[PDB]
Amino acid sequence: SMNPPPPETSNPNKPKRQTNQLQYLLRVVLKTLWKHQFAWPFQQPVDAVKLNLPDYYKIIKTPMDMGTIKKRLENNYYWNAQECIQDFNTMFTNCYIYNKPGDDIVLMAEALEKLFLQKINELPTEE
Ligand SMILES: Cc1sc2c(c1C)C(c1ccc(Cl)cc1)=N[C@@H](CC(=O)Nc1nncs1)c1nnc(C)n1-2
């Protein structure tokens, strides 16, 4: 069994910038989700080998996790807030695609997603 390489977190070929919105995504959004009691499954890529999930990376072809997002934000990898919001949405959606309704991990994702929605609702206007 083998895991894929993780999503990239650095690429000199990719345009990037700092924006006040991206700063909020790190300081408010990421930080709020990261400290949550239910964050831990999402703090790093799914280890399909150790979890014995050999079909995971057949079903989930665009993996994403908050460890990757955190590094992307700390590295200023993004051009805009939408790119980062899309990564969060991919992460939640992947969990719902792979798992069953009412599974613990789905309840965890829902708790994080509720906070994510609350925080992104107050994403500042771009400066
Ligand atoms: C470190 C990680 S990452 C992760 C998980 C763990 C431990 C777990 C998980 C399970 C319960 C709780 Cl309380 C918390 C987490 N769920 C897997 C799916 C899975 O294991 N399905 C199975 N089907 N029967 C046998 S195991 C999963 N799906 N997305 C993510 C992200 N995970």
Swiss-Prot record:
Tissue: Ubiquitously expressed.
Record PTM: Phosphorylation by CK2 disrupt the intramolecular binding between the bromo domain 2 and the NPS region and promotes binding between the NPS and the BID regions, leading to activate the protein and promote binding to acetylated histones. In absence of phosphorylation, BRD4 does not localize to p53/TP53 target gene promoters, phosphorylation promoting recruitment to p53/TP53 target promoters.
Cross-link annotation Glycyl lysine isopeptide (Lys-Gly) (interchain with G-Cter in SUMO2), location: K58
Transmembrane intervals: none
Sites marked Acetylated histone binding: N99
Subcellular location: Nucleus; Chromosome
Domain Bromo stretches: 17-123
Family under the similarity heading: Belongs to the BET family.
Oligomer status and interactors: Interacts with p53/TP53; the interaction is direct. Interacts (via CTD region) with CDK9 and CCNT1, acting as an associated component of P-TEFb complex. Interacts with RELA (when acetylated at 'Lys-310'). Interacts (via NET domain) with NSD3, CHD4, BICRA and ATAD5. The interaction with BICRA bridges BRD4 to the GBAF complex. Interacts (via NET domain) with JMJD6 (via JmjC and N-terminal domains); the interaction is stronger in presence of ssRNA and recruits JMJD6 on distal enhancers. Interacts with NSD3. Interacts with NIPBL.
Function as written in the Swiss-Prot or TrEMBL entry: Chromatin reader protein that recognizes and binds acetylated histones and plays a key role in transmission of epigenetic memory across cell divisions and transcription regulation. Remains associated with acetylated chromatin throughout the entire cell cycle and provides epigenetic memory for postmitotic G1 gene transcription by preserving acetylated chromatin status and maintaining high-order chromatin structure. During interphase, plays a key role in regulating the transcription of signal-inducible genes by associating with the P-TEFb complex and recruiting it to promoters.
Involvement in disease: Cornelia de Lange syndrome 6: A form of Cornelia de Lange syndrome, a clinically heterogeneous developmental disorder associated with malformations affecting multiple systems. It is characterized by facial dysmorphisms, abnormal hands and feet, growth delay, cognitive retardation, hirsutism, gastroesophageal dysfunction and cardiac, ophthalmologic and genitourinary anomalies. CDLS6 inheritance is autosomal dominant.
Domain notes: The NET domain mediates interaction with a number of chromatin proteins involved in transcription regulation (NSD3, JMJD6, CHD4, GLTSCR1 and ATAD5).
Other notes: JQ1, a thieno-triazolo-1,4-diazepine derivative, and I-BET, a benzodiazepine derivative, have been tested on tumors with success. Treatment with GSK1210151A (I-BET151, a I-BET derivative) has strong effets on mixed lineage leukemia and promotes myeloid differentiation and leukemia stem-cell depletion.
Designated name of the protein: Bromodomain-containing protein 4
Organism: Homo sapiens (Human)
Whole-protein residues included: 44 to 168 of 1362
